[PDB]
Ligand binder design. Structure first.
Ligand code: HEM
Length: 457
């Protein structure tokens, strides 16, 4: 029966804003959820949102006939450069539905067979970089994983090589995109957006859009000119027609999808690999068990697709890192119609909800009371996890289109890492989670000792 929604203390016209004075708002909101429970309202001047934390309420939120994906303010600023790509489109936009129908078969578990060789290509480069470090040296984990995922997505996405392992300063495209992403995030905390002190920012953001558009438009035009087929997504987008309308994507939209895959894919996948390595080095017994499987399964100089599929425990490791620290930590929904949530909380059409995924993943009625512990064995039998309890890829038709890709990629790379090196948390690293569009273990570093096992040929 109808309840008032909990809300943290408001401070006059500042409302709840003083409780979020932080560059780590997700982490700050988990602490409010621990105080207030499965649902709370959070008010800033001019904005209201509800934060959901329990599997019980999230399962309702995930009903697509009642709620649909909302573009949060972050996603609307990212739309300045990612346009109506899949990630920053409303569900009702014709290009959302066209791209979705055209691209889905290109992201399935089956489609992974055709990307695997390109993924091995960048994965071998990463292993060789680490084999070639001298004794005195260490690895900057998120930085190398970001080099890996950007290059993998560039190769599989549109057969372009950013050659990140050949560079101290990334390819201009990558500098621009990271900077554009950075600016989108900085605009959120921007008190007075139109003050002249942000004129250089605006100009730089415009310059970064042109850089990104120019490269991608040039590669699209070059592939149409050359007319040749690759195993890449760009080939699928140029030949693909929506079975609903029978129409292909236009060139501009194809550009946006390409910028989208890179922008949406690379940082979350990078974060996942970094957190996985974090948890392994902090849990040596889990590390040994994963390394044992890697040694037993990956008996070839390079992994085949079928071998990657056999790495069950590595898969469990990844899921358990996603349970604790899902690298896209929140997603936003609006009420399609007036509705009552959980039998107690009335909502009007348009009202916004945010799913706080790390807090969902600590629901003790689902996971047990030990929710903070890293235990991959939670995932030994995935069919036994209750529906909507584990949501690191979002929900329904607006769920992560890259989920198979990200998992295949992380499994492959992690298995290769576990196979070829021993690791040492030589600084006793204290976890520091930076928040942007995604989560990542900032400043995470390790030493790898090579097991001297020969590689790909
Ligand atoms: C560990 C890696 C990843 C995680 C945790 C992650 C998470 C997510 C989440 C939570 C969403 C839903 C966002 C929302 O509701 O607003 C999403 C959507 C999306 N993701 Fe991922 N992602 C990952 C990797 C990737 C990769 C590798 C790609 C592409 C190569 C990708 C492409 C996309 C796209 C295009 C969408 C929009 C789908 C749509 O709305 O139709 N993601 N992802």
């Amino acid at each position: 029966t109808i309840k008032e929604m909990p809300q943290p203390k408001t401070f006059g016209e500042l409302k709840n804003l003083p409780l979020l004075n932080t560059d780590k708002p997700v982490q700050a909101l988990m602490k409010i959820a621990d105080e207030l429970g499965e649902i709370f309202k959070f008010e800033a001047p001019g904005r209201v949102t509800r934060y959901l934390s329990s599997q019980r309420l999230i399962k309702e939120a995930c009903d697509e006939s009642r709620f649909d994906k909302n573009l949060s303010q972050a996603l609307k600023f990212v739309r300045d450069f990612a346009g109506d790509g899949l990630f920053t489109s409303w569900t009702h936009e014709k290009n959302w539905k066209k791209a979705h129908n055209i691209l889905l078969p290109s992201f399935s578990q089956q489609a992974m067979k055709g990307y695997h060789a390109m993924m091995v290509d960048i994965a071998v480069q990463l292993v060789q970089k680490w084999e070639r470090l001298n004794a005195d040296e260490h690895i900057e984990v998120p930085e190398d994983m970001t080099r890996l995922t950007l290059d993998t997505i560039g190769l599989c996405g549109f057969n372009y090589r950013f050659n990140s392992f050949y560079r101290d300063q990334p390819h201009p495209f990558i500098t621009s995109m990271v900077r554009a992403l950075d600016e989108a995030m900085n605009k959120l905390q921007r008190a007075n957006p139109d003050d002249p002190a942000y004129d250089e920012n605006k100009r730089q953001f415009q310059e970064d859009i042109k850089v990104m558009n120019d490269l991608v438009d040039k590669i699209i035009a070059d592939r149409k000119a050359s007319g040749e087929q690759s195993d890449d997504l760009l080939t699928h987008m140029l030949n693909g027609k929506d079975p609903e309308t029978g129409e292909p994507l236009d060139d501009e939209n194809i550009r946006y999808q390409i910028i989208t895959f890179l922008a949406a894919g690379h940082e979350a996948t990078s974060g996942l690999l970094s957190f996985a390595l974090y948890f392994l080095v902090k849990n040596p017994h889990v590390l040994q068990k994963a390394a044992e499987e890697a040694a037993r399964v990956l008996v070839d100089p390079v992994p085949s697709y079928k071998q990657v599929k056999q790495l069950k425990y590595v898969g469990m490791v990844l899921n358990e890192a996603l349970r604790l620290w899902p690298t896209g930590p929140a997603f936003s929904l609006y009420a399609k119609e007036d509705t009552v949530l959980g039998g107690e909380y009335p909502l009007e059409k348009g009202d916004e909800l945010m799913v706080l995924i790390p807090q969902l993943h600590r629901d003790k009625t689902i996971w047990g009371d030990d929710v903070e512990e890293f235990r991959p064995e939670r995932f030994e039998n995935p069919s036994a996890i209750p529906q909507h309890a584990f949501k690191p890829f979002g929900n329904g038709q607006r769920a992560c289109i890259g989920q198979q890709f990200a998992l295949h990629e992380a499994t492959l790379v992690l298995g290769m890492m576990l196979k070829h090196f021993d690791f040492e948390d030589h600084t006793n690293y204290e976890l520091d989670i930076k928040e942007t569009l995604v989560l990542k273990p900032e400043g995470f570093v390790v030493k790898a000792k090579s097991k001297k096992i020969p590689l790909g040929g």
